[PDB]
Design a protein around this nucleic acid. Structure first.
Lengths: 120, 129
RNA sequence: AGGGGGACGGUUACCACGGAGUGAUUCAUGACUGGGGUGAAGUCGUAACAAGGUAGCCGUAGGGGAACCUGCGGCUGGAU
RNA sequence: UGGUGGGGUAAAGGCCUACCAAGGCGACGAUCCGUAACUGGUCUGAGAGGAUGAUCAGUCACACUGGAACUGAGACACGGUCCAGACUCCUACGGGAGGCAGCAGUGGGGAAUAUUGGACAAUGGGCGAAAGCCUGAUCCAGCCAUGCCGCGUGUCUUUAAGUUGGGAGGAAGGGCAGUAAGUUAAUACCUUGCUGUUUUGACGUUACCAACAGAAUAAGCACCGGCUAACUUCGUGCCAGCAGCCGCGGUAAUACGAAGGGUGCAAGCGUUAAUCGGAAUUACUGGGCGUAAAGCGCGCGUAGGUGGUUCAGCAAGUUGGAUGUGAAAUCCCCGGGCUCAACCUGGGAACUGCAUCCAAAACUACUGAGCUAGAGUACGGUAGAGGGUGGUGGAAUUUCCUGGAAGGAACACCAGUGGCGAAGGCGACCACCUGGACUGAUACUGACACUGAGGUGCGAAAGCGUGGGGAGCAAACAGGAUUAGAUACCCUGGUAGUCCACGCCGUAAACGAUGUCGACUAGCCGUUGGGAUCCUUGAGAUCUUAGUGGCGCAGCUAACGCGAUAAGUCGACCGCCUGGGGAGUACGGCCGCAAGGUUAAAACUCAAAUGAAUUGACGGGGGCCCGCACA
RNA sequence: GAGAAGGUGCGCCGGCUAGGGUGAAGGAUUUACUCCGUAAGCUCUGGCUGGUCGAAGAUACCAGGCCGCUGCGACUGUUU
């Protein structure tokens, strides 16, 4: 740790590994739905949430959350991916964005229309 | 072993500054004697006392203030390891310039005030504050 | 006449690409396996936390469905 | 890698060559492996820095892929040739051709990126006596909120926009036909530079000025549980959902879906992603390690880092000035301009840098003579479970048998907060060959120094070697009693093992969970070895040291607590740490007969695990006490 | 393992060159069933360089085929 020992072997700053294995410094990355299904939350909560499995165009097998209150993503859609880790859902770190290509958009959704895919 | 002559005297008086002793004696060199002469001229100590015999020694007579004495800390900067050879534009004004910042130069082991008005830099030795 | 000197020749070294044999070193994949993580926890259980109902723990051999036991040297992170 | 003879390049040179020699490179990281044009700079930053190379400018590099020369001043040539390969194309089957990383543009990939534009009028170039001729470089236009500025959507003005009328600046000159000049052998004459006039040439065709009709043509987004002072209800009910961290929803919901209002700042508002930051969260500035993560188990010591002491010298580091630069751009100030701001430049500032030069000598290295403190030895004297070899023992206990005979093993007391060894470690008695320190001084050495990656030995016991022994116990087990069960503690039994010789493993709760070394800062009480002081009979005080302990201030510490044996103040160096899991684990290397050991990862996953301390509770925790709780 | 696998050279004639063994024209004396070493002669094995002929140079006879997974038996051996 001394300045002699720094010239011998200097302090290497340890790199921080990124949170997303996919999205290789890309803000969005297109995918194709392998499977949409139902997932339970973590124990101190309880609900029924709907997540999707996608293969990406990087060929990767990760899960994205369909963030709508209603969707017609019918098992082969062309859904677009953002990041962000949903807390209550374990082990998954991606979200399907609304109104991208095949994501139809949440019904009425009258505030936050830029988030959940609504015109006007 | 002992590895630095003048860092061994700058430590041995500070624990005596917080102790109740006045005359500090140790086996001394000319290097430790040239340092001691400049801060008695700054009002910190007095009467360095080369013993002038074989194995010559320094009896620095440090002054006391009432209660807490006059020199709080002596911080070594250029120890022997990283030895802080510094220019004249970059002299340390230690405590607003109330530290006198003695710097070893060719024409004298001298305070930072006369180191800048006659411009030679070098070994920034220690905090005197 | 021809000579000098050139040109196409002849073949000699050099070499890219290609060939062959045998290895290295990397990347993807692989029936089938072995642990790991997170879950939800059904289960034999009670293994640790009190002297946790046999004091724990560490090394190591050795042994046994498991959360686990003896020995030899070891430590109190052991208390009345 | 050098040496010479030659050969060769525009030019030095194993560049090419023959032969001579055995050199060269590298722990300051060679070679191999993965990665990437580099820089001025750029972005976050207090700065140090960290990240980073899109427009802009310098250098480099490439032209389907590879090899190769040719011509030329200049190439191993992007719209050259040759050869080879891959691909593609026209064929009338004779023979042919092509290379968009040039500007458009097309697929195709992708989250994602533009027009098959106008003209050489400006600036260049390329040829030309000149005229000019070409240029997808350029000047400049469509397309895109992609930034960066300004500006507008009204408080009865008309800006923008649109209609009309106006209106600079981008033009330097060219043609010409005189006019004067100076080379002229002959200003005869050409050719040229000058002068004044005439003729003409603008891609963007306008910016810009001034009229006109009339508010006609203009706002959106996200949130509102907290620490963001934007903060009723209605629907929904642990549903549906939101969210960055807590969390919210389980029936009056400020946390989720609307309405109803505000607020952030605006033609943009938001969230996905990446960078730095706060992050002292890799701490040079500027952190750690007794118990939270972290001291190898410790030595000998190689490179190296640093090095007691004095004079003199050197001027490598250090210090000042001098000069060339550190390109321009960017930035930083003062400005000038667009009506203002961007933007544009002018001036400087800045560019902490680099070598050269002279000047300096306090300190460092180096050089030389030294100096005795550090460190070592010549001289005994004890202390000492140092350690090893061989023996001699004793009681139990054990095994026999008529109290003896027989052999294994650890040696009660002496035993000690004692010694000894770097460490691990080590006690009956006895010799025998051997260690290092202490101390009493007396002699001499002249820093010979400490520390030390690698490197190298040496390290408790279960082990498993390769041979033996044999008591007790006991790993391995059989049952006995016990429980739903013992596979357990208890009960009856015993081989491996400890022992020995050589050899291997190199493991640890190797622990004082505290690296080695030196220096210094109040003490006090035992205790170990010397020695000297001491009225001295020691029953012993004091002093002096080198160990081993207690308690305590100064001191530090998160606290527990350390406290001259530091965990303080410091100094040199070394080993080690970067959230908990994964994991001291996989894979690769090394060692081992095996068990395995040593070096040592990410993928994933969680917002916490951990440290000391305090209150409460609990305890088959102790100790007192109370009550028919016990008779 | 291994002669793993795979490869190269190979005739004859010259040119140049490095030795080794034997030997003695005569000299040392132990004047002889001996040492030193002449020399040639004879004989053995190289190294570098050309040249040359044919389809072919271990030209005939002679003279291993090799490799990758496996079962069983360890191996040499023995047997109807």
């Amino acid at each position: 740790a001394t300045i002699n020992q720094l010239v011998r072997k200097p302090r290497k700053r340890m790199v921080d590994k990124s949170d997303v294995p996919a999205l290789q410094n890309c803000p969005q990355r297109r995918g194709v739905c392998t499977r949409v299904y139902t997932t339970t939350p973590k124990k101190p909560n309880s609900a029924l949430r709907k997540v999707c499995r996608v293969r990406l165009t990087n060929g990767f097998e990760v899960s994205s959350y369909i963030g709508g209150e209603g969707h017609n993503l019918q098992e082969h859609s062309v859904v677009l991916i953002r990041g962000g880790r949903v807390k209550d859902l374990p082990g998954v770190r991606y979200h399907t964005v609304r109104g991208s290509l095949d994501t139809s958009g949440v019904k009425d959704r009258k505030q936050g229309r830029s988030k959940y895919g609504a015109k006007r | 072993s002992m590895q630095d002559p003048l860092a061994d005297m700058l430590t041995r008086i500070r624990n005596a500054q917080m102790a109740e002793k006045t005359v500090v004696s140790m086996p001394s060199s000319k290097l430790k004697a040239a340092v001691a002469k400049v801060l008695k001229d700054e009002g910190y100590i007095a009467d360095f006392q080369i013993s002038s015999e074989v194995k010559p020694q320094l009896s620095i007579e440090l002054k006391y203030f009432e209660g807490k004495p006059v020199i709080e800390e002596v911080k070594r900067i250029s120890r022997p390891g990283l030895r802080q050879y510094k220019s004249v534009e970059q002299l340390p004004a230690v405590r607003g310039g109330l530290g006198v910042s003695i710097v070893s130069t060719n024409k004298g082991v001298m305070t930072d005030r006369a180191a800048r008005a006659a411009g030679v830099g070098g070994e920034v030795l220690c905090t005197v504050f």
